[PDB]
Amino acid sequence: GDVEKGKKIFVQKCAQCHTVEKGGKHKTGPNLHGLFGRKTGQAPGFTYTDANKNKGITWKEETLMEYLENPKKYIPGTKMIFAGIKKKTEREDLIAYLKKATNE
Ligand code: HEC
C-alpha cells in the first residue's frame, strides 16, 4: 500500500469532508484521527446517523476495504454521499495513507 499515492487519493476524493489530524476539525464528515481499531460512529463531537452509530464493526484494513468500495451497501442509510472506490490497488493505497495519517 503506497502511502504517497494514498495521500493524493485522499485529497481528490475525501478531503472535502474529512480531516485526519489529531483534534482536527469536523466538517461535513467526522475527523478521522484514531480510526483504526475503533468502532463505527465513535468520533467525539460528531452527530452520526443511527445507521453509522449502530453498524457495530471495528475499523481496520479488512473493514475499510469493503466499506470504501461501496459505503451505502456496507452501511445502508449512511449520510456519507460517496459512490465508492472500485479498484483494489487504489483502496490499498488510500488505506495505507489513513493507517499512517490517522495515527500521527
Ligand atoms: C475517502 C473516499 C473517504 C473516506 C476514506 C471516508 N469518507 Fe466519509 N463520511 C462522511 C459523513 C457525513 C460521514 C458520517 C455519515 C453517517 O454517519 O452516516 C462519513 C463517514 C465515514 C467513516 C466512518 C466514521 C466512523 O467513525 O464510523 C469513514 C471511515 C469515512 N467516512 C471515510 C462524509 C464524506 C464525504 C462528504 C460528501 C466524502 C466525499 C467522504 N465522506 C469520503 C470519504
UniProtKB/Swiss-Prot annotation:
<feature type="binding site" description="axial binding residue">
    <location>
        <position position="18"/>
    </location>
    <ligand>
        <name>heme c</name>
    </ligand>
</feature>
<dbReference type="InterPro" id="IPR036909">
    <property type="entry name" value="Cyt_c-like_dom_sf"/>
</dbReference>
<dbReference type="GO" id="GO:0020037">
    <property type="term" value="F:heme binding"/>
</dbReference>
<dbReference type="GO" id="GO:0042802">
    <property type="term" value="F:identical protein binding"/>
</dbReference>
<protein>
    <recommendedName>
        <fullName>Cytochrome c</fullName>
    </recommendedName>
</protein>
<feature type="modified residue" description="N6-acetyllysine; alternate">
    <location>
        <position position="72"/>
    </location>
</feature>
<dbReference type="GO" id="GO:0018063">
    <property type="term" value="P:cytochrome c-heme linkage"/>
</dbReference>
<feature type="modified residue" description="Phosphotyrosine">
    <location>
        <position position="48"/>
    </location>
</feature>
<feature type="modified residue" description="Phosphotyrosine">
    <location>
        <position position="97"/>
    </location>
</feature>
<dbReference type="InterPro" id="IPR002327">
    <property type="entry name" value="Cyt_c_1A/1B"/>
</dbReference>
<keyword id="KW-0408">Iron</keyword>
<dbReference type="GO" id="GO:0008289">
    <property type="term" value="F:lipid binding"/>
</dbReference>
<dbReference type="GO" id="GO:0070069">
    <property type="term" value="C:cytochrome complex"/>
</dbReference>
<comment type="function">
    <text>Plays a role in apoptosis. Suppression of the anti-apoptotic members or activation of the pro-apoptotic members of the Bcl-2 family leads to altered mitochondrial membrane permeability resulting in release of cytochrome c into the cytosol. Binding of cytochrome c to Apaf-1 triggers the activation of caspase-9, which then accelerates apoptosis by activating other caspases.</text>
</comment>
<feature type="modified residue" description="N6-acetyllysine">
    <location>
        <position position="99"/>
    </location>
</feature>
<keyword id="KW-0053">Apoptosis</keyword>
<dbReference type="GO" id="GO:0005829">
    <property type="term" value="C:cytosol"/>
</dbReference>
<keyword id="KW-0249">Electron transport</keyword>
<keyword id="KW-0349">Heme</keyword>
<dbReference type="GO" id="GO:0006122">
    <property type="term" value="P:mitochondrial electron transport, ubiquinol to cytochrome c"/>
</dbReference>
<comment type="function">
    <text>Electron carrier protein. The oxidized form of the cytochrome c heme group can accept an electron from the heme group of the cytochrome c1 subunit of cytochrome reductase. Cytochrome c then transfers this electron to the cytochrome oxidase complex, the final protein carrier in the mitochondrial electron-transport chain.</text>
</comment>
<feature type="binding site" description="axial binding residue">
    <location>
        <position position="80"/>
    </location>
    <ligand>
        <name>heme c</name>
    </ligand>
</feature>
<keyword id="KW-0479">Metal-binding</keyword>
<dbReference type="GO" id="GO:0046872">
    <property type="term" value="F:metal ion binding"/>
</dbReference>
<dbReference type="GO" id="GO:0005758">
    <property type="term" value="C:mitochondrial intermembrane space"/>
</dbReference>
<feature type="modified residue" description="N6-succinyllysine">
    <location>
        <position position="55"/>
    </location>
</feature>
<keyword id="KW-0679">Respiratory chain</keyword>
<feature type="modified residue" description="N6-succinyllysine; alternate">
    <location>
        <position position="72"/>
    </location>
</feature>
<dbReference type="GO" id="GO:0009055">
    <property type="term" value="F:electron transfer activity"/>
</dbReference>
<keyword id="KW-0813">Transport</keyword>
<dbReference type="Pfam" id="PF00034">
    <property type="entry name" value="Cytochrom_C"/>
</dbReference>
<keyword id="KW-0496">Mitochondrion</keyword>
<feature type="modified residue" description="N-acetylglycine">
    <location>
        <position position="1"/>
    </location>
</feature>
<feature type="binding site" description="covalent">
    <location>
        <position position="14"/>
    </location>
    <ligand>
        <name>heme c</name>
    </ligand>
</feature>
<dbReference type="GO" id="GO:0097190">
    <property type="term" value="P:apoptotic signaling pathway"/>
</dbReference>
<feature type="binding site" description="covalent">
    <location>
        <position position="17"/>
    </location>
    <ligand>
        <name>heme c</name>
    </ligand>
</feature>
<keyword id="KW-0597">Phosphoprotein</keyword>
<dbReference type="GO" id="GO:0006123">
    <property type="term" value="P:mitochondrial electron transport, cytochrome c to oxygen"/>
</dbReference>
<dbReference type="InterPro" id="IPR009056">
    <property type="entry name" value="Cyt_c-like_dom"/>
</dbReference>
<comment type="similarity">
    <text>Belongs to the cytochrome c family.</text>
</comment>
<keyword id="KW-0007">Acetylation</keyword>
